[PDB]
């Protein structure tokens, strides 16, 4: 029972690690879109800081 629970929590943590990596990718795409929209002056230095956080 213990080795079954350990293998299943290993698979679950690898799956949600992959999902967290995909959310990091989408957040990085949001950040460099906001950085592109910050240099020319559409977005101020508040939405850029929110995307950075």
């Amino acid at each position: 029972a213990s080795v079954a629970t350990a293998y299943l929590t290993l698979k679950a943590d690898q799956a949600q690690l992959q999902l967290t990596k995909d959310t990091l990718g989408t957040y990085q795409k949001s950040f460099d879109l906001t950085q592109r929209s910050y240099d020319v002056g559409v977005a101020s230095a508040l939405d850029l800081r929110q995307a950075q956080t």
Partner: protein, 52 residues
Amino acid sequence: DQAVSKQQYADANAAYLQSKAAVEQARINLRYTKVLSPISGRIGRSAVTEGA
């Protein structure tokens, strides 16, 4: 420090210049309420008087 965008600074500057044009409209209209003589010379007599 860019705590406000350049877009909503150019919008506010455009609103300021447009309102300054709309108030100098009323300033030259007050300049038209009083009657300024356009050229210099011998003025004749008044065709309409005070109160007409």
